[PDB]
């Protein structure tokens, strides 16, 4: 069983070292907290939270970094290397990369103004990476609500509260124009914009992402508070201002009978959202972990030991 006190004796300062690393990085890269939370999410949705995502290429298996959901998209890997080196200096061969990334995600959320809690610990590191599984398992921004639900259920998160609450991770961070071009100019081959996108916000998005423009340009997920972890993401959805298709479907999909009340509940109360986010985060963090003597305590998160 995973437990929050796992390193209370072996590496009591692990959480603090992780925190200090993120604080320093945030001074030069204000997007890093959002980037780290996403890394943990992509780790957990592929063979569980086993740091498989941190592995680089080898001649026997391809890195998950080349998956459609990660390539020219996932970021912050060197920052994970920095805190790992610091933790290894403070407590040699003790903290797994899987647990380190889980802590980084939680500390990232707290530093951005979100809830503060102690994550269950005790996860161990995979001995391989899973590119194909990553391409099959990571949900896409163009998914319909049924597909998003199918995506979460496939990795073990059956509750609509898991989907709605974890989607709140879009209360901060960036998204490329590439992923909303269809919503802005030709949604589902209709030759028209997505009708569930607020018309006033549509004009704004079109100015940031003009047709034939730089598809890699970045746009904020939350137009209210771009870098603050709060419940404003949900207030946006209620106004048809979710950024990507998968955001707005939580509230506008014909299959959203069960998600609509959750969106409203989280938009109405910070406390309610925060509680559900912690709950959903720990459930996602509990997806098929390697524990005990399974896997290893990777010394360099990029490669398997020796
Ligand atoms: C429900 C399905 C989800 C879909 C389809 C989705 C879609 C997206 C897309 C397309 C991006 C933009 C990437 C880019 O432009 O390079 C992204 C960014 C992000 N996502 Fe999600 N996501 C999902 C769930 C989540 C979850 C569960 C979390 C965390 C709990 C998360 C955290 C983030 C963060 C923080 C960013 C910004 C990262 C950065 O700015 O570096 N996402 N996601
Ligand atoms: C970031 O996530 C994704 C990106 C793509 C990109 C496809 C393309 O460029 O053709 C597809 C699916 C994803 O889940
Ligand atoms: Ca993984
Ligand atoms: Ca916000």
């Amino acid at each position: 069983q995973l437990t929050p006190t796992f390193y209370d004796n072996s590496c009591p300062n692990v959480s603090n070292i992780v925190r200090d690393t993120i604080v320093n990085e945030l001074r030069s890269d204000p997007r890093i907290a959002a980037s780290i939370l996403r890394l943990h999410f992509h780790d957990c949705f592929v063979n569980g939270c086993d740091a498989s995502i941190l592995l680089d290429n080898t001649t026997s298996f391809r890195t998950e970094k080349d998956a459609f959901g990660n390539a020219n998209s996932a970021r912050g890997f060197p920052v994970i290397d920095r805190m790992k080196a610091a933790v290894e200096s403070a407590c040699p061969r003790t903290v797994s990369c899987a647990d380190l990334l889980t802590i980084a995600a939680q500390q990232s959320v707290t530093l951005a103004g979100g809830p503060s809690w102690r994550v269950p610990l005790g996860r161990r590191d995979s001995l391989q990476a899973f590119l194909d599984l990553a391409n099959a398992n990571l949900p896409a921004p163009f998914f319909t609500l049924p597909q998003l639900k199918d995506s979460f259920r496939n990795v073990g998160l059956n509750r609509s509260s898991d989907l709605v609450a974890l989607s709140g991770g879009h209360t901060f961070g960036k998204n490329q124009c590439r992923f909303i071009m269809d919503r802005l100019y030709n949604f589902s081959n209709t030759g028209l914009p997505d009708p569930t996108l607020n018309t006033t916000y549509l004009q704004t998005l079109r100015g940031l992402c003009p047709l034939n423009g730089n598809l890699s340009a970045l746009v904020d997920f939350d137009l209210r508070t771009p870098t603050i972890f709060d419940n404003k993401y949900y207030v946006n959805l209620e106004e048809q201002k979710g950024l990507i298709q998968s955001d707005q479907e939580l509230f506008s999909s014909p299959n959203a009978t069960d998600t609509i009340p959750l969106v409203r509940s989280f938009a109405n109360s910070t406390q309610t959202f925060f509680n559900a986010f912690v709950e959903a985060m720990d459930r996602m963090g509990n997806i098929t972990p390697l524990t005990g003597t399974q896997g290893q305590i990777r010394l360099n998160c990029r490669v398997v030991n020796s």
Side-chain angles (χ1 to χ4, degrees), residues 82-127:
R82 190 176 309 137
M83 56 177 72
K84 172 61 174 179
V87 173
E88 279 302 312
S89 289
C91 61
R93 310 179 296 288
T94 301
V95 181
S96 67
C97 291
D99 272 355
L100 184 75
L101 183 54
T102 300
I103 302 177
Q106 174 274 117
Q107 296 290 136
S108 286
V109 164
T110 304
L111 281 166
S116 182
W117 77 106
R118 303 195 78 207
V119 304
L121 293 165
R123 307 178 187 68
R124 291 169 66 86
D125 301 325
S126 71
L127 307 163

mmCIF file of all heavy atoms in Angstrom, residues 82-127:
data_model
loop_
_atom_site.group_PDB
_atom_site.id
_atom_site.type_symbol
_atom_site.label_atom_id
_atom_site.label_comp_id
_atom_site.label_asym_id
_atom_site.label_seq_id
_atom_site.Cartn_x
_atom_site.Cartn_y
_atom_site.Cartn_z
ATOM 1 N N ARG A 82 17.358 18.010 -12.238
ATOM 2 C CA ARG A 82 17.989 18.856 -11.219
ATOM 3 C C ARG A 82 17.538 18.454 -9.825
ATOM 4 O O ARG A 82 18.369 18.203 -8.954
ATOM 5 C CB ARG A 82 17.668 20.341 -11.465
ATOM 6 C CG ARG A 82 18.469 21.329 -10.598
ATOM 7 C CD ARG A 82 18.130 22.769 -11.001
ATOM 8 N NE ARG A 82 18.269 22.927 -12.447
ATOM 9 C CZ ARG A 82 17.411 23.575 -13.224
ATOM 10 N NH1 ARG A 82 16.335 24.147 -12.706
ATOM 11 N NH2 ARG A 82 17.619 23.624 -14.535
ATOM 12 N N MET A 83 16.230 18.383 -9.600
ATOM 13 C CA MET A 83 15.769 17.982 -8.272
ATOM 14 C C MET A 83 16.186 16.546 -7.943
ATOM 15 O O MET A 83 16.437 16.225 -6.780
ATOM 16 C CB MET A 83 14.240 18.143 -8.130
ATOM 17 C CG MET A 83 13.401 17.411 -9.160
ATOM 18 S SD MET A 83 11.622 17.616 -8.838
ATOM 19 C CE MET A 83 11.386 19.370 -9.298
ATOM 20 N N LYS A 84 16.271 15.681 -8.954
ATOM 21 C CA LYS A 84 16.682 14.297 -8.702
ATOM 22 C C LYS A 84 18.130 14.286 -8.210
ATOM 23 O O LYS A 84 18.463 13.583 -7.257
ATOM 24 C CB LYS A 84 16.549 13.438 -9.976
ATOM 25 C CG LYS A 84 17.140 12.018 -9.866
ATOM 26 C CD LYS A 84 16.486 11.160 -8.782
ATOM 27 C CE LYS A 84 17.009 9.720 -8.833
ATOM 28 N NZ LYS A 84 16.416 8.850 -7.776
ATOM 29 N N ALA A 85 18.989 15.070 -8.852
ATOM 30 C CA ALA A 85 20.393 15.137 -8.452
ATOM 31 C C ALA A 85 20.523 15.655 -7.018
ATOM 32 O O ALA A 85 21.323 15.144 -6.223
ATOM 33 C CB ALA A 85 21.173 16.046 -9.409
ATOM 34 N N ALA A 86 19.737 16.676 -6.695
ATOM 35 C CA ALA A 86 19.762 17.264 -5.357
ATOM 36 C C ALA A 86 19.288 16.242 -4.329
ATOM 37 O O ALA A 86 19.898 16.093 -3.270
ATOM 38 C CB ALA A 86 18.881 18.500 -5.313
ATOM 39 N N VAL A 87 18.206 15.533 -4.640
ATOM 40 C CA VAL A 87 17.688 14.517 -3.725
ATOM 41 C C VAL A 87 18.700 13.379 -3.572
ATOM 42 O O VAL A 87 18.919 12.884 -2.467
ATOM 43 C CB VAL A 87 16.323 13.967 -4.213
ATOM 44 C CG1 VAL A 87 15.872 12.790 -3.350
ATOM 45 C CG2 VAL A 87 15.278 15.083 -4.159
ATOM 46 N N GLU A 88 19.336 12.972 -4.668
ATOM 47 C CA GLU A 88 20.330 11.906 -4.582
ATOM 48 C C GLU A 88 21.521 12.329 -3.718
ATOM 49 O O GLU A 88 22.159 11.498 -3.073
ATOM 50 C CB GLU A 88 20.824 11.503 -5.971
ATOM 51 C CG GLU A 88 19.889 10.549 -6.710
ATOM 52 C CD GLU A 88 19.643 9.263 -5.931
ATOM 53 O OE1 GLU A 88 20.621 8.643 -5.453
ATOM 54 O OE2 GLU A 88 18.469 8.867 -5.793
ATOM 55 N N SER A 89 21.827 13.622 -3.712
ATOM 56 C CA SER A 89 22.938 14.113 -2.902
ATOM 57 C C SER A 89 22.543 14.065 -1.430
ATOM 58 O O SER A 89 23.334 13.665 -0.578
ATOM 59 C CB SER A 89 23.301 15.551 -3.285
ATOM 60 O OG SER A 89 23.921 15.606 -4.555
ATOM 61 N N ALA A 90 21.307 14.463 -1.144
ATOM 62 C CA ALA A 90 20.801 14.482 0.226
ATOM 63 C C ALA A 90 20.505 13.089 0.772
ATOM 64 O O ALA A 90 20.752 12.806 1.945
ATOM 65 C CB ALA A 90 19.546 15.323 0.289
ATOM 66 N N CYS A 91 19.959 12.215 -0.065
ATOM 67 C CA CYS A 91 19.666 10.857 0.373
ATOM 68 C C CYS A 91 19.893 9.861 -0.766
ATOM 69 O O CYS A 91 18.967 9.505 -1.498
ATOM 70 C CB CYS A 91 18.232 10.761 0.922
ATOM 71 S SG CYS A 91 16.839 11.137 -0.197
ATOM 72 N N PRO A 92 21.141 9.380 -0.905
ATOM 73 C CA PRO A 92 21.564 8.427 -1.935
ATOM 74 C C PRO A 92 20.696 7.192 -2.150
ATOM 75 O O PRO A 92 20.357 6.477 -1.206
ATOM 76 C CB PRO A 92 22.978 8.048 -1.497
ATOM 77 C CG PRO A 92 23.455 9.278 -0.759
ATOM 78 C CD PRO A 92 22.239 9.639 0.047
ATOM 79 N N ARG A 93 20.322 6.972 -3.406
ATOM 80 C CA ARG A 93 19.556 5.794 -3.796
ATOM 81 C C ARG A 93 18.307 5.531 -2.964
ATOM 82 O O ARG A 93 17.993 4.381 -2.653
ATOM 83 C CB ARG A 93 20.486 4.583 -3.725
ATOM 84 C CG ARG A 93 21.820 4.809 -4.455
ATOM 85 C CD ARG A 93 22.742 3.602 -4.363
ATOM 86 N NE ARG A 93 23.145 3.342 -2.986
ATOM 87 C CZ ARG A 93 24.001 4.095 -2.298
ATOM 88 N NH1 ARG A 93 24.561 5.163 -2.861
ATOM 89 N NH2 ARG A 93 24.291 3.790 -1.039
ATOM 90 N N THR A 94 17.572 6.584 -2.633
ATOM 91 C CA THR A 94 16.390 6.419 -1.797
ATOM 92 C C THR A 94 15.045 6.724 -2.437
ATOM 93 O O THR A 94 14.104 5.941 -2.329
ATOM 94 C CB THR A 94 16.518 7.283 -0.509
ATOM 95 O OG1 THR A 94 17.694 6.896 0.214
ATOM 96 C CG2 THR A 94 15.327 7.088 0.379
ATOM 97 N N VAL A 95 14.954 7.866 -3.099
ATOM 98 C CA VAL A 95 13.701 8.289 -3.698
ATOM 99 C C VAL A 95 13.600 7.919 -5.175
ATOM 100 O O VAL A 95 14.440 8.320 -5.978
ATOM 101 C CB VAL A 95 13.547 9.815 -3.551
ATOM 102 C CG1 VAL A 95 12.214 10.273 -4.153
ATOM 103 C CG2 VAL A 95 13.666 10.208 -2.070
ATOM 104 N N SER A 96 12.559 7.163 -5.525
ATOM 105 C CA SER A 96 12.335 6.753 -6.910
ATOM 106 C C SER A 96 11.941 7.967 -7.743
ATOM 107 O O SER A 96 11.427 8.956 -7.216
ATOM 108 C CB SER A 96 11.200 5.733 -6.993
ATOM 109 O OG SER A 96 9.961 6.325 -6.633
ATOM 110 N N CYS A 97 12.177 7.881 -9.048
ATOM 111 C CA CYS A 97 11.811 8.961 -9.943
ATOM 112 C C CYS A 97 10.296 9.076 -9.984
ATOM 113 O O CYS A 97 9.749 10.172 -10.119
ATOM 114 C CB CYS A 97 12.366 8.693 -11.352
ATOM 115 S SG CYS A 97 14.182 8.811 -11.398
ATOM 116 N N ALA A 98 9.615 7.942 -9.851
ATOM 117 C CA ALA A 98 8.153 7.931 -9.891
ATOM 118 C C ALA A 98 7.573 8.747 -8.736
ATOM 119 O O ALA A 98 6.659 9.552 -8.928
ATOM 120 C CB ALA A 98 7.632 6.486 -9.840
ATOM 121 N N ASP A 99 8.105 8.529 -7.539
ATOM 122 C CA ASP A 99 7.661 9.255 -6.346
ATOM 123 C C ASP A 99 8.119 10.713 -6.457
ATOM 124 O O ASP A 99 7.386 11.632 -6.094
ATOM 125 C CB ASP A 99 8.281 8.642 -5.088
ATOM 126 C CG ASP A 99 7.460 7.508 -4.508
ATOM 127 O OD1 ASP A 99 6.352 7.232 -5.008
ATOM 128 O OD2 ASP A 99 7.934 6.903 -3.521
ATOM 129 N N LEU A 100 9.341 10.927 -6.944
ATOM 130 C CA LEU A 100 9.862 12.295 -7.078
ATOM 131 C C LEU A 100 8.939 13.142 -7.957
ATOM 132 O O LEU A 100 8.648 14.299 -7.644
ATOM 133 C CB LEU A 100 11.271 12.281 -7.688
ATOM 134 C CG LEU A 100 11.962 13.649 -7.799
ATOM 135 C CD1 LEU A 100 12.442 14.087 -6.415
ATOM 136 C CD2 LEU A 100 13.128 13.580 -8.768
ATOM 137 N N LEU A 101 8.460 12.558 -9.056
ATOM 138 C CA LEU A 101 7.586 13.289 -9.973
ATOM 139 C C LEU A 101 6.210 13.502 -9.379
ATOM 140 O O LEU A 101 5.521 14.476 -9.709
ATOM 141 C CB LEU A 101 7.462 12.546 -11.307
ATOM 142 C CG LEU A 101 6.644 13.149 -12.460
ATOM 143 C CD1 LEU A 101 7.099 14.570 -12.790
ATOM 144 C CD2 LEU A 101 6.817 12.255 -13.698
ATOM 145 N N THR A 102 5.794 12.584 -8.514
ATOM 146 C CA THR A 102 4.483 12.717 -7.900
ATOM 147 C C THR A 102 4.542 13.923 -6.952
ATOM 148 O O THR A 102 3.638 14.763 -6.940
ATOM 149 C CB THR A 102 4.106 11.463 -7.102
ATOM 150 O OG1 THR A 102 4.072 10.324 -7.978
ATOM 151 C CG2 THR A 102 2.740 11.640 -6.463
ATOM 152 N N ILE A 103 5.621 13.999 -6.182
ATOM 153 C CA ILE A 103 5.817 15.095 -5.231
ATOM 154 C C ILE A 103 5.932 16.428 -5.965
ATOM 155 O O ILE A 103 5.386 17.446 -5.526
ATOM 156 C CB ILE A 103 7.090 14.874 -4.393
ATOM 157 C CG1 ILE A 103 6.996 13.539 -3.642
ATOM 158 C CG2 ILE A 103 7.265 16.044 -3.403
ATOM 159 C CD1 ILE A 103 8.233 13.170 -2.824
ATOM 160 N N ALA A 104 6.653 16.421 -7.080
ATOM 161 C CA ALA A 104 6.841 17.626 -7.881
ATOM 162 C C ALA A 104 5.506 18.164 -8.389
ATOM 163 O O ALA A 104 5.289 19.377 -8.438
ATOM 164 C CB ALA A 104 7.763 17.327 -9.049
ATOM 165 N N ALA A 105 4.610 17.261 -8.760
ATOM 166 C CA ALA A 105 3.302 17.654 -9.265
ATOM 167 C C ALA A 105 2.503 18.304 -8.138
ATOM 168 O O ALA A 105 1.874 19.355 -8.326
ATOM 169 C CB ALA A 105 2.557 16.430 -9.802
ATOM 170 N N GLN A 106 2.520 17.674 -6.969
ATOM 171 C CA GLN A 106 1.783 18.216 -5.829
ATOM 172 C C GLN A 106 2.362 19.568 -5.406
ATOM 173 O O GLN A 106 1.614 20.520 -5.178
ATOM 174 C CB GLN A 106 1.814 17.227 -4.644
ATOM 175 C CG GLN A 106 1.182 17.766 -3.347
ATOM 176 C CD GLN A 106 2.159 18.576 -2.492
ATOM 177 O OE1 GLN A 106 1.969 19.784 -2.264
ATOM 178 N NE2 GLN A 106 3.203 17.917 -2.021
ATOM 179 N N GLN A 107 3.685 19.662 -5.319
ATOM 180 C CA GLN A 107 4.320 20.925 -4.909
ATOM 181 C C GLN A 107 4.084 22.009 -5.952
ATOM 182 O O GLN A 107 3.926 23.181 -5.608
ATOM 183 C CB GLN A 107 5.820 20.732 -4.669
ATOM 184 C CG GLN A 107 6.130 19.782 -3.519
ATOM 185 C CD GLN A 107 5.780 20.357 -2.150
ATOM 186 O OE1 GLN A 107 5.201 19.668 -1.304
ATOM 187 N NE2 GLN A 107 6.144 21.614 -1.922
ATOM 188 N N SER A 108 4.052 21.612 -7.222
ATOM 189 C CA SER A 108 3.799 22.547 -8.305
ATOM 190 C C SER A 108 2.408 23.138 -8.142
ATOM 191 O O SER A 108 2.224 24.336 -8.307
ATOM 192 C CB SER A 108 3.880 21.845 -9.671
ATOM 193 O OG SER A 108 5.222 21.562 -10.017
ATOM 194 N N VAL A 109 1.430 22.289 -7.835
ATOM 195 C CA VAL A 109 0.047 22.733 -7.663
ATOM 196 C C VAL A 109 -0.084 23.703 -6.471
ATOM 197 O O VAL A 109 -0.767 24.730 -6.556
ATOM 198 C CB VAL A 109 -0.897 21.517 -7.461
ATOM 199 C CG1 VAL A 109 -2.235 21.960 -6.903
ATOM 200 C CG2 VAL A 109 -1.109 20.795 -8.802
ATOM 201 N N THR A 110 0.587 23.378 -5.377
ATOM 202 C CA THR A 110 0.541 24.221 -4.184
ATOM 203 C C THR A 110 1.218 25.562 -4.438
ATOM 204 O O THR A 110 0.663 26.610 -4.111
ATOM 205 C CB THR A 110 1.197 23.504 -3.009
ATOM 206 O OG1 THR A 110 0.539 22.250 -2.820
ATOM 207 C CG2 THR A 110 1.061 24.332 -1.707
ATOM 208 N N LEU A 111 2.391 25.537 -5.061
ATOM 209 C CA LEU A 111 3.114 26.772 -5.352
ATOM 210 C C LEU A 111 2.337 27.705 -6.273
ATOM 211 O O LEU A 111 2.525 28.925 -6.226
ATOM 212 C CB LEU A 111 4.475 26.468 -5.980
ATOM 213 C CG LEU A 111 5.606 26.036 -5.039
ATOM 214 C CD1 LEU A 111 6.760 25.449 -5.846
ATOM 215 C CD2 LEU A 111 6.076 27.242 -4.208
ATOM 216 N N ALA A 112 1.469 27.141 -7.108
ATOM 217 C CA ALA A 112 0.666 27.941 -8.032
ATOM 218 C C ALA A 112 -0.614 28.453 -7.355
ATOM 219 O O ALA A 112 -1.460 29.075 -7.998
ATOM 220 C CB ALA A 112 0.319 27.110 -9.279
ATOM 221 N N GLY A 113 -0.753 28.186 -6.055
ATOM 222 C CA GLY A 113 -1.918 28.646 -5.311
ATOM 223 C C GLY A 113 -2.975 27.587 -5.027
ATOM 224 O O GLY A 113 -4.046 27.899 -4.488
ATOM 225 N N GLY A 114 -2.678 26.337 -5.383
ATOM 226 C CA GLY A 114 -3.633 25.264 -5.184
ATOM 227 C C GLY A 114 -3.581 24.621 -3.816
ATOM 228 O O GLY A 114 -2.851 25.080 -2.931
ATOM 229 N N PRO A 115 -4.343 23.537 -3.616
ATOM 230 C CA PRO A 115 -4.327 22.882 -2.308
ATOM 231 C C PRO A 115 -2.967 22.297 -1.960
ATOM 232 O O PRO A 115 -2.111 22.090 -2.831
ATOM 233 C CB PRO A 115 -5.417 21.821 -2.433
ATOM 234 C CG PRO A 115 -5.378 21.471 -3.897
ATOM 235 C CD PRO A 115 -5.247 22.841 -4.548
ATOM 236 N N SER A 116 -2.784 22.033 -0.674
ATOM 237 C CA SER A 116 -1.551 21.469 -0.155
ATOM 238 C C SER A 116 -1.908 20.160 0.553
ATOM 239 O O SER A 116 -2.822 20.128 1.379
ATOM 240 C CB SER A 116 -0.918 22.449 0.837
ATOM 241 O OG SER A 116 0.320 21.955 1.330
ATOM 242 N N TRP A 117 -1.211 19.082 0.212
ATOM 243 C CA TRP A 117 -1.471 17.787 0.834
ATOM 244 C C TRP A 117 -0.247 16.906 0.676
ATOM 245 O O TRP A 117 0.652 17.231 -0.105
ATOM 246 C CB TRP A 117 -2.708 17.117 0.210
ATOM 247 C CG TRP A 117 -2.501 16.485 -1.149
ATOM 248 C CD1 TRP A 117 -2.420 15.145 -1.433
ATOM 249 C CD2 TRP A 117 -2.405 17.165 -2.403
ATOM 250 N NE1 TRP A 117 -2.286 14.951 -2.796
ATOM 251 C CE2 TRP A 117 -2.270 16.175 -3.413
ATOM 252 C CE3 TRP A 117 -2.422 18.515 -2.777
ATOM 253 C CZ2 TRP A 117 -2.149 16.498 -4.774
ATOM 254 C CZ3 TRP A 117 -2.302 18.839 -4.135
ATOM 255 C CH2 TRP A 117 -2.166 17.826 -5.116
ATOM 256 N N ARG A 118 -0.203 15.807 1.428
ATOM 257 C CA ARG A 118 0.917 14.878 1.351
ATOM 258 C C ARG A 118 0.493 13.697 0.502
ATOM 259 O O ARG A 118 -0.451 12.980 0.840
ATOM 260 C CB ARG A 118 1.317 14.368 2.733
ATOM 261 C CG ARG A 118 1.680 15.447 3.736
ATOM 262 C CD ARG A 118 2.397 14.815 4.910
ATOM 263 N NE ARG A 118 3.787 14.536 4.573
ATOM 264 C CZ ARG A 118 4.525 13.583 5.134
ATOM 265 N NH1 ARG A 118 4.010 12.792 6.067
ATOM 266 N NH2 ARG A 118 5.788 13.429 4.762
ATOM 267 N N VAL A 119 1.202 13.494 -0.600
ATOM 268 C CA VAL A 119 0.892 12.408 -1.514
ATOM 269 C C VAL A 119 1.349 11.049 -0.995
ATOM 270 O O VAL A 119 2.347 10.937 -0.278
ATOM 271 C CB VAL A 119 1.567 12.648 -2.911
ATOM 272 C CG1 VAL A 119 1.154 14.001 -3.482
ATOM 273 C CG2 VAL A 119 3.086 12.613 -2.774
ATOM 274 N N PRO A 120 0.596 9.990 -1.324
ATOM 275 C CA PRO A 120 0.993 8.656 -0.883
ATOM 276 C C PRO A 120 2.312 8.400 -1.612
ATOM 277 O O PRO A 120 2.479 8.843 -2.754
ATOM 278 C CB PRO A 120 -0.124 7.767 -1.424
ATOM 279 C CG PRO A 120 -1.307 8.665 -1.414
ATOM 280 C CD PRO A 120 -0.740 9.968 -1.936
ATOM 281 N N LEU A 121 3.237 7.699 -0.971
ATOM 282 C CA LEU A 121 4.531 7.413 -1.574
ATOM 283 C C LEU A 121 4.879 5.912 -1.499
ATOM 284 O O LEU A 121 4.171 5.134 -0.845
ATOM 285 C CB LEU A 121 5.604 8.273 -0.890
ATOM 286 C CG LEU A 121 5.430 9.781 -1.168
ATOM 287 C CD1 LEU A 121 6.260 10.611 -0.200
ATOM 288 C CD2 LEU A 121 5.837 10.097 -2.613
ATOM 289 N N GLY A 122 5.956 5.512 -2.180
ATOM 290 C CA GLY A 122 6.365 4.118 -2.185
ATOM 291 C C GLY A 122 6.423 3.516 -3.588
ATOM 292 O O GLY A 122 6.682 2.328 -3.740
ATOM 293 N N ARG A 123 6.184 4.329 -4.614
ATOM 294 C CA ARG A 123 6.237 3.859 -5.999
ATOM 295 C C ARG A 123 7.676 3.579 -6.412
ATOM 296 O O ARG A 123 8.612 4.183 -5.867
ATOM 297 C CB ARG A 123 5.673 4.922 -6.948
ATOM 298 C CG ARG A 123 4.304 5.429 -6.587
ATOM 299 C CD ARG A 123 3.864 6.508 -7.555
ATOM 300 N NE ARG A 123 2.617 7.125 -7.109
ATOM 301 C CZ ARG A 123 2.521 7.878 -6.018
ATOM 302 N NH1 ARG A 123 3.601 8.103 -5.277
ATOM 303 N NH2 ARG A 123 1.352 8.390 -5.663
ATOM 304 N N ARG A 124 7.851 2.667 -7.373
ATOM 305 C CA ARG A 124 9.181 2.350 -7.889
ATOM 306 C C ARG A 124 9.208 2.539 -9.407
ATOM 307 O O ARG A 124 8.158 2.612 -10.062
ATOM 308 C CB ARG A 124 9.627 0.950 -7.453
ATOM 309 C CG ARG A 124 9.884 0.915 -5.934
ATOM 310 C CD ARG A 124 10.066 -0.488 -5.400
ATOM 311 N NE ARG A 124 11.269 -1.123 -5.924
ATOM 312 C CZ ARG A 124 12.479 -0.999 -5.394
ATOM 313 N NH1 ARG A 124 12.669 -0.256 -4.307
ATOM 314 N NH2 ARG A 124 13.503 -1.627 -5.947
ATOM 315 N N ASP A 125 10.419 2.646 -9.941
ATOM 316 C CA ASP A 125 10.651 2.944 -11.352
ATOM 317 C C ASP A 125 10.643 1.777 -12.323
ATOM 318 O O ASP A 125 11.238 0.733 -12.049
ATOM 319 C CB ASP A 125 11.974 3.693 -11.456
ATOM 320 C CG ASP A 125 11.958 4.981 -10.660
ATOM 321 O OD1 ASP A 125 10.882 5.616 -10.607
ATOM 322 O OD2 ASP A 125 13.007 5.354 -10.097
ATOM 323 N N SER A 126 9.973 1.982 -13.454
ATOM 324 C CA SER A 126 9.860 0.974 -14.516
ATOM 325 C C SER A 126 11.225 0.615 -15.098
ATOM 326 O O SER A 126 12.196 1.362 -14.934
ATOM 327 C CB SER A 126 8.980 1.509 -15.652
ATOM 328 O OG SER A 126 9.648 2.536 -16.377
ATOM 329 N N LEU A 127 11.282 -0.528 -15.788
ATOM 330 C CA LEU A 127 12.507 -1.003 -16.424
ATOM 331 C C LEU A 127 12.396 -0.857 -17.953
ATOM 332 O O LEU A 127 13.217 -1.396 -18.699
ATOM 333 C CB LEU A 127 12.736 -2.478 -16.062
ATOM 334 C CG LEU A 127 12.708 -2.791 -14.557
ATOM 335 C CD1 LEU A 127 12.534 -4.293 -14.348
ATOM 336 C CD2 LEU A 127 13.985 -2.285 -13.895
#
